[PDB]
Every structure is written in C-alpha cells, then in structure tokens.
C-alpha cells in the first residue's frame, strides 16, 4: 500500500538504472514518470555513445542531470531543486534515438512536499 521516497521541496534525489549496453534495438536508456491521474511524461534519455544524445523534458531542464557509466553498466539521474510537481512514479526504460520503450513495470514512487 503506497510506499515511496519523500523529499522536501528544494531537496535532491539520485536515481539509478541498470544499462546493459547498446543492442541492435536500443542505443540508450532513460526515465519517464507518471503522476497520479496523469499520462506518462518523458523525463530524460541518454545515449550509450558519448556525445550522441542527452534529452530532457522542458519541465526538468537545468534541475535534472542524466549521466552514464558504461564500465558499471549504469545510468543515473540527479534530481536537484525538487518541487511538488515532480511528485510521480519514475520508471527506467531502454531508449532508441531518445524515445523510451516499455514492455510489461514496478517503478520508484517519489513524493515532493512543498
């Protein structure tokens, strides 16, 4: 019954996602989110290839930073300056040319309190 992370407004959180590496199908990894009663929203995506793509939703630009560590097969999302409107469940997904592809889901629930 509805457990997650709790962060005060202005605070920070780091998410991580396992990132197995590029396939014929996928060339990166990213996050989307879904807030209560709202549709899924793109958050960020990054290419496995250094320098290829780094996309952000306009609502998170400047506050969230995505990065990759290919030696650890991981991607990370540093979420700074959190605000109440960032309250959502966050989901990792593989990317192809920046678009995110989900099959099957789980997720990390995040509540940001003003």
């Amino acid at each position: 019954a509805s457990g997650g992370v709790f962060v005060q407004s202005g605070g920070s959180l780091r998410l991580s996602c396992a990132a197995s590496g590029a396939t014929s199908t996928f060339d990166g990894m990213g996050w989307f989110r879904q807030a209560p009663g709202k549709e899924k929203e793109f958050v960020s995506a990054i290419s496995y290839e250094q320098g290829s793509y780094t996309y952000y939703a306009d609502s998170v630009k400047g506050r969230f930073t995505i990065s990759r560590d290919n030696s650890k097969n991981m991607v990370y999302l540093q979420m700074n300056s959190l605000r109440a409107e960032d309250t959502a469940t966050y989901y990792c997904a593989p990317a192809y040319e920046g678009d995110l592809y989900a099959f099957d889901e789980q997720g990390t629930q995040v509540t940001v309190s003003s």
Partner: peptide, 10 residues
C-alpha cells in the same frame, strides 16, 4: 506483441 512508447521532446 505490445509496447508502450514514451516519446522524446518535440
């Protein structure tokens, strides 16, 4: 058989 796509920014 099925997929959910979440598109990158326009």
């Amino acid at each position: 058989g099925s997929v959910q796509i979440v598109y990158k920014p326009k």
